[PDB]
């Protein structure tokens, strides 16, 4: 249920102070905002941590901690492939709902009418 707009704005005839002060006229646009990007991640940090622990506990010798090293490299490879998969996934289809461009096509077929 949408919050009401009955006596919330500063209008003629309203006996009240304005509840809301909208900086833009509260009318639905024919547009939907574009999809925001994802942000910084800092991936592979935990494995990098486990790798660098071995190094300082073992005079910085790789042959000492091959398994931790391999964990860091495989986390890096999986992170890169996750990046590629996620890029192609967000290009392919938005999860659950529809793409902003196609929703804008829909809103262009049934436009808002603030006039008469």
């Amino acid at each position: 249920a949408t919050p009401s707009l009955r006596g919330r704005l500063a209008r003629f005839g309203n006996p009240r102070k304005p509840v809301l002060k909208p900086n833009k006229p509260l009318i639905l646009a024919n547009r939907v905002g574009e999809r925001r990007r994802e942000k910084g991640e800092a991936t592979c940090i935990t494995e990098m941590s486990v790798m660098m622990a071995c190094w300082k506990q073992n005079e910085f010798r790789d042959d000492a901690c091959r398994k931790e090293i391999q964990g860091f490299l495989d986390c890096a490879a999986r992170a890169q492939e996750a990046r590629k998969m996620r890029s192609i996934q967000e290009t392919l289809g938005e999860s659950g709902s529809l793409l902003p461009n196609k929703l804008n096509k829909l809103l262009q077929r049934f436009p808002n009418k603030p006039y008469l």
């Binding site: 949408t2 919050p3 509840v19 809301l20 900086n23 639905l28 939907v32 196609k102 049934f110």
Partner: protein, 86 residues
């Protein structure tokens, strides 16, 4: 401080999924608006700005809920073109 020490905001881990438990904890705090309260009460917000913010958020809620009623009301007509060549 004067309540019972381990009931409030307490989630239990299941099987060993601590990640399915912290995410849950952050979700109750987000859903009850605790997290945004902490972020907003790190620095004092002067009451003029309190009113301006809490009016912009309410106008945003009204507008967002209206485009959502419109997007759902018209997602039925996103069916294939019934008369392709007009």
């Amino acid at each position: 401080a004067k309540h019972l020490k381990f009931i409030a905001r307490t989630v239990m881990v299941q099987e060993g999924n601590v990640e399915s438990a912290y995410r849950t904890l952050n979700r109750i705090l987000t859903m009850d608006g605790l997290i945004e309260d902490i972020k907003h009460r790190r620095y004092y917000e002067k009451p003029c700005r309190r009113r301006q913010r809490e009016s912009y958020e309410r106008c945003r809620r009204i507008y967002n809920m209206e485009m959502a009623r419109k997007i759902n009301f018209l997602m039925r007509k996103n069916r294939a073109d019934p008369w392709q060549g007009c």
